[PDB]
């Protein structure tokens, strides 16, 4: 009952989308597609599917009932567990309903979708990806052991009037940490929180950064807020920026091991010019 | 940072009005209601409440006293800091007093009131609005990425004998800028100022504008001066005016995130044209 080991018509609730897409399955119902999570091809594909959940996570039991699923899948944030006990009961009147809980913003997610991939019958590729991730981390950490030892990384995204520096326990900061990379001291105020927030005046916190990553969507596009952060004249004064070492980062969220490796690939490419 | 007693008898000074309204709180004391800032129903209601501050920002310390507050809230322009540290003292003798500073004419205001909404016990809805604003910018920017690339916007308001073109660091112009929109070159002489002023002779400075927004009050009514600008004979000469693309903009001076979303709605609607 651990993550590591030694159906025909699927409704995909939240986090179920990435699982069925990777398995080449077509869902009979899907949570409302958010464009930033998917490639252009994927999004225009996903839009051909009936919406059975809002992006606010509000579920449409009736629309699901019309979809006639034989299996309903999705992940749940562990904090909302008891809440989803009732939801599963309600949903199981339509079809067998498999939920999995996940915790934090790091490995918990890509493990959770590994379990969903097994359930929908795609455990082979999914377990392969997990092993590949673990191998690549080993291989990368020793192949560039020098660069990882003397370079300080930072991951940022922007919000409204402020920006964030991603912590060692979350998204691309988790993956960077798992690799063994050093990360900026802008992280320190985050504590157990996923990011540390700063005003545009506090951009100078990232002066110990030799390399900076900034989150983008699935098509390498920064959101306006992240672009706004890159525009600030105070930003154009950081060591890493006038070194030409500021790079885009796709799939920082890393909802699967397949996605998490794409992060490893981006981290690796930068290490080649380092 | 903005991103992450208990009251029942609140006096709302300047900028505290939008906060108590949005929270469904009836204030015991309120700054003199200016009708252009509120709906007909909001204004009608707000006139019931005792006036404890003048529209010229003069505080009636004894009217506040009789109101018997247990909490006094309001926002302060950053320039007038020390002058208000003083005021809080005399105020703190009446009840706990919360003043927040804000800077500029952009994101600083809706964040300041986000903080006041937290203080009065309404931080949930307030943070929801902030998150929703940030999501919808991201959303609108990508969904209309074409329109936003090919279109040049302008925001104008009228004054006596002159008119103004709003800059990228202020009000409706800031939000338009945050979205990623292109805006007219009439903004240039503003520099760091919130607006660039012109005579009715220089209306031709808006020839590159494909779309034009004109500030109105909370009830979609332009002020007489703005109304005069739209009457000028050189105005119906502009491309955007003879293309049918001149629209009213409410809540340009977006005081809260709820208001800043209503601005985004209006921009989205126009963008659903073009």
UniProtKB/TrEMBL annotation, chain B:
Residues 8-274 form the Fe/B12 periplasmic-binding domain. It is found in: Cell envelope. Its main location: other. Keywords: Signal, Transport. GO terms for cellular component: outer membrane-bounded periplasmic space. GO terms for biological process: iron coordination entity transport. Belongs to the bacterial solute-binding protein 8 family. This is Similar to iron(III) dicitrate transport permease RBL00804. It comes from Thermobifida fusca (strain YX). The chain holds residues 92 to 361 of 361 of the full protein.
